[PDB]
Design a protein around this ligand. Structure first.
Ligand SMILES: *[C@@H]1O[C@H](CO)[C@@H](O[C@@H]2O[C@H](CO)[C@@H](O)[C@H](O)[C@H]2NC(C)=O)[C@H](O)[C@H]1NC(C)=O
Ligand SMILES: *[C@@H]1O[C@H](CO)[C@@H](O)[C@H](O)[C@H]1NC(C)=O
Ligand SMILES: [Mg+2]
Length: 458
């Protein structure tokens, strides 16, 4: 019933030269997945840091489990479940859980993320001897552990010590983001967050316009990567690549995303695309827009980056706005979109939500500079602290799910939940967009190199 979304097919409007532009709309109905939805706390245990991956028919879903008052040091195991996304006669898909595992060892599995390839599930975890509130910022960590899972049961476990991981930076702490990894070539590629020393600052992304009460923009930009009193500890994103050889030997590498390519280490995920992969990031910091970096064979550079000025992060729920300028305020909320075309020039995601200020969640479909469609949703939540959107083919139609963490209004209970909604694809003469007041418009491009708007009257 469920397969990966074929992005090339979804965007193939080429047989329609008179309506050649792909576009997308959000279907008005949100559908529950009750078997994948649960409170954070239940009967002396907490289930935190949810992460999900989708494969051919299967999903892989995982939470870190803690006992007692649910501090970091109370972590007891990693719960992982594998099931299928199926039609059970409802208007939206449902989960059919097949296997649940409780993964554990003497060391803590301090941070884990999941991936799926075909009907095989993978769980990659950072291991540590001690796990505290400070592990994410200062470590230490001892290595990685990789679990291979199928419907029947666990197949294999692999591990590698930190000293055997090839790295291009001085890495003091390593955490995996909640977004899934992706199988690419014979490897698994995951996004990580690392505490790093001795980094190069050349080319740090930083505006050159005037910023309030700042003469040295560059220094403010560099300083804003730091989360602790240690002046030589920068919080940055890394790409974690793991391989298992036929002999069953695990190798791993961790590659820094330099300051010239990305902002402070933030949540995100790896995106599969034809011919490569991308890194979708929901910045914690002052550059408060979604960014997407993808492999670029043509360009000698590794990653080509897209800034979605149209798609704000949750930054402004809790930090002051204004001209985009380096400041210290950060949010830990995050919203990871996914791509709807091969190049990621069209993305879809779900906004977060505060309990104040007329804050509302929205599903939004965007290009870098425009909003294609948006829909206010999740009035049943008083707040939403994180979202991860993933899309797939179900019943031969484009569908998406969102994994979110938030507080339900009716009960005040914090929950992790997964819900689904259908997408509508069409091929159009002129793609329409929404202006800041919600009026729909399109551009009547001209051959001399000009564009003018026009209002869509329904
Ligand atoms: C999203 O951000 C909010 C605001 O910073 C976080 O809520 C704060 O942090 C904890 C809640 O766990 C409390 O100590 C504070 O009182 C909260 N403030 C408010 C206004 O609620 C929230 O935890 C974040 N959620 C995620 C998933 O990042
Ligand atoms: C690192 O890898 C080498 C080569 O496989 C192996 O001999 C060595 O035991 C590993 N080190 C640790 C600490 O496991
Ligand atoms: Mg369900």
């Amino acid at each position: 019933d469920m397969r990966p979304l074929n992005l090339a097919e979804l965007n193939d409007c080429s047989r329609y030269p008179q309506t050649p532009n792909p576009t997308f709309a959000i279907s008005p109905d949100i559908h529950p997945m009750p078997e994948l939805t649960e409170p954070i706390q239940l009967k002396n245990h907490c289930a935190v840091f949810p992460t999900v991956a989708l494969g051919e028919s299967i999903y892989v879903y995982s939470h870190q489990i803690r006992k007692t008052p649910c501090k970091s040091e109370d972590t007891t195991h990693q719960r992982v479940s594998l099931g299928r996304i199926v039609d059970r006669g409802f208007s939206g898909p449902r989960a059919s859980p097949l296997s649940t595992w409780d993964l554990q060892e003497t060391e803590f599995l301090s941070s884990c993320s999941v991936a799926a390839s075909g009907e095989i599930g993978w769980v990659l975890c950072v291991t540590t001897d001690k796990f505290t509130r400070d592990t994410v910022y200062a470590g230490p960590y001892t290595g990685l552990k990789l679990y291979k899972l199928s419907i029947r049961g666990q197949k294999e476990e692999y591990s590698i010590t930190a000293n055997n991981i090839t790295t291009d930076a001085v890495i003091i702490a390593l955490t995996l983001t909640r977004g899934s990894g992706v199988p690419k070539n014979n490897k698994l590629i995951f996004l990580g967050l690392a505490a790093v020393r001795d980094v190069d600052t050349t080319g740090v992304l930083c505006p050159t316009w005037k910023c309030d009460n700042i003469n040295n923009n560059v220094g403010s930009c560099v300083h804003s990567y730091r989360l602790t009193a240690d002046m030589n500890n920068y919080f940055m994103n890394v790409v974690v690549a793991v391989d298992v050889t036929p002999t069953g030997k695990m190798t791993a590498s961790v590659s820094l995303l330099p300051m010239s390519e990305s902002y402070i280490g933030s949540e995100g995920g790896v995106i599969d695309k034809p011919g490569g992969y991308g890194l979708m990031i929901s910045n914690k910091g002052w550059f408060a827009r979604i960014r997407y970096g993808q492999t670029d064979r043509a360009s000698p550079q590794r990653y080509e980056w897209t800034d979605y000025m149209s798609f704000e992060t949750p930054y402004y729920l809790y930090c002051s706005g204004g001209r985009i300028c380096p400041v210290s305020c950060k949010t830990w909320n995050f919203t990871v979109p996914t791509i709807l075309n091969p190049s990621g020039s069209i993305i879809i995601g779900v906004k977060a939500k505060s309990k104040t200020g007329n804050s509302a969640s929205m599903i939004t479909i965007n290009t870098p500079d425009e909003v294609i469609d948006q829909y206010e949703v999740f009035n049943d939540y008083q707040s939403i602290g994180s979202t991860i959107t993933k899309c797939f083919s179900y019943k031969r139609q484009p569908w998406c799910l969102v994994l979110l963490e938030g507080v339900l209004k009716s009960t005040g209970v914090t929950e992790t939940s997964i819900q689904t909604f259908k997408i509508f694809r069409s091929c159009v003469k002129h793609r329409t967009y929404l202006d800041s007041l919600g009026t729909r418009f399109y551009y009547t491009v001209s051959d001399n190199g000009n564009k003018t708007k026009q209002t869509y009257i329904p």
